[PDB]
Design a protein around this ligand. Structure first.
Ligand SMILES: [Zn+2]
Ligand SMILES: [Zn+2]
Lengths: 306, 306
């Protein structure tokens, strides 16, 4: 038993991290097959970031202007191209440690593991969620740009995030592996507004099911409710509205615990209106929304990967 | 910026996990060089666990009674021996992926990463602390026995924990890699009492320094205090006493923030007596003690590994 904010094993991703250097800037890149992916602002100086013209900046650069370090090995940049906000540095050698991989664009509320790297060397791993406003609340220092987020499906690594920058507010923004930013953010140093951050209701409900599975039952109550009545209370406390698709995803958890989804919603409603009263749920004094219904089932059943 | 409960990259450890099967029981083992380490109760049936005589049980077993799976490869048990509570199955092949490793016995309050495995396959990774009562609050399901905890020093993997069992209270107990249990626990299915669990004061203080580094300053106050006055308040709320060694370890954090250790203690005292008042510190409504002073510096400076 027990419940922990669990990350995927990062072994398959560590073997893909390289150090990319262009001019004076150095950051991380993802080396799959014979292509290296990295944020395009590796070609920028600190002055350029204020208002960069990436096309003009990239035209001044040639293949031999990029230095790619795979630990102690050299990769020769033979071709270079810009796809949206990422650079695709075609190298001469294909990564022998390339895993079965796949590029995906996740949706808000989905969770993934981040491998924070500096100078192409792994530093740590943690799990986090894509906020509804398309930001992530991560842990990134200077030079962490290029670090990637990923999920693992048995034997496939699904790359979903590449880190690009820290907003003036301390939150983090990035792109998919095709270079398309999550959210309305651009890769320049300017004041950018992130939308209102709401709580991921479906994730909170999955977390409450995990608590029941692990022995925490005090928040259960004899009340019930409807979807509409619950939503109207949810939006007052900045909670994502619940749809029928959300109720469907929670089905398996409902069947394992014998607690109807709508009965759990009524319990959540009372928690929002009256609070926690200094008590805890799975060791937390706040409601946690960084566990998807899929994360809960896999940790409470023992899913593995190869 | 930002702060996250960060685990070490687990790539170096994934290549050492194997599946060990003896009779009908199957659990995880650690394959370093030509030796496989695993909990000795792999030789027990569900009935044996109630009161096992490990010497007599092991004498009925021969080298060919143990089945070691390294994914799709076979390892031939040529020699077997029992060291305290772990079995050392000497195999014919040396693990080619053996990293620079080292066995260590950590002290209470120290943190490490756990790689939860099932049937010798990695499932997830998380960071946790050794409680003062020598338990850990982890996430383990049936068959997770043999999963190991570890730290990484640049290029050395320091193995410090092997999981053995879940107590009736839901907490977890294990041994070092020499087979010596942490705490007064034995490897049998009986009611075992874990001591009073106290909060790791030095870790809480490091966490408050991390908050100041990241912008949370509201808990700072114009008060001060002495070590004795603070300790006397700490023990009322079940907090480990603070020694001079603890003050010394926090020196670097004191110098980076310009806040004297004793001034931070006075802030912590007021937090214990008056509470949080519904506010948060680094996104938490409770005081966190699973970050050592070393964890904080390494995440706020960007330490990497190879
Ligand atoms: Zn950058
Ligand atoms: Zn066991």
């Amino acid at each position: 038993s027990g419940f922990r904010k669990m990350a995927f094993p990062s072994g398959k991703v560590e073997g893909c991290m390289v150090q990319v250097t262009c001019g004076t800037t150095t950051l991380n890149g993802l080396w799959l097959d014979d292509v290296v992916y990295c944020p395009r602002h590796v070609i920028c100086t600190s002055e350029d970031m204020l208002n960069p013209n990436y096309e003009d900046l990239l035209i001044r650069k040639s293949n031999h202007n990029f230095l790619v370090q795979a630990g102690n090995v050299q990769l020769r940049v033979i071709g270079h191209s810009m796809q949206n906000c990422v650079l695709k540095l075609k190298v001469d050698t294909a990564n022998p440690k390339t895993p079965k991989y796949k590029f995906v664009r996740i949706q808000p509320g989905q969770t993934f593991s981040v491998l924070a790297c500096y100078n192409g060397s792994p530093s740590g791993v943690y799990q986090c969620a894509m906020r509804p406003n398309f930001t992530i609340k991560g842990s990134f220092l200077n030079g962490s740009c290029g670090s990637v987020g990923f999920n693992i499906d048995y034997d496939c690594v699904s790359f979903c995030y590449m880190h690009h920058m820290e907003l003036p507010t301390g939150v983090h923004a990035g792109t998919d592996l095709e270079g398309n930013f999550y959210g309305p953010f651009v890769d320049r140093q300017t004041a950018q507004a992130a939308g209102t951050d709401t709580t991921i209701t479906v994730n909170v409900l999955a977390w409450l099911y995990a608590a029941v599975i692990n022995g925490d039952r005090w928040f259960l109550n004899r009340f019930t409710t409807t979807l509409n009545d619950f939503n109207l209370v949810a939006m007052k406390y900045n909670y994502e509205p619940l749809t029928q698709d959300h109720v469907d995803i929670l089905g398996p958890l409902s069947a394992q615990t014998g607690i109807a989804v709508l009965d759990m919603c009524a319990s959540l409603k009372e928690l929002l209106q009256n609070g926690m009263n200094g008590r805890t749920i799975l060791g937390s004094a706040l409601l946690e929304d960084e566990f998807t219904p899929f994360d809960v089932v896999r940790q409470c059943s023992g899913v593995t990967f190869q």
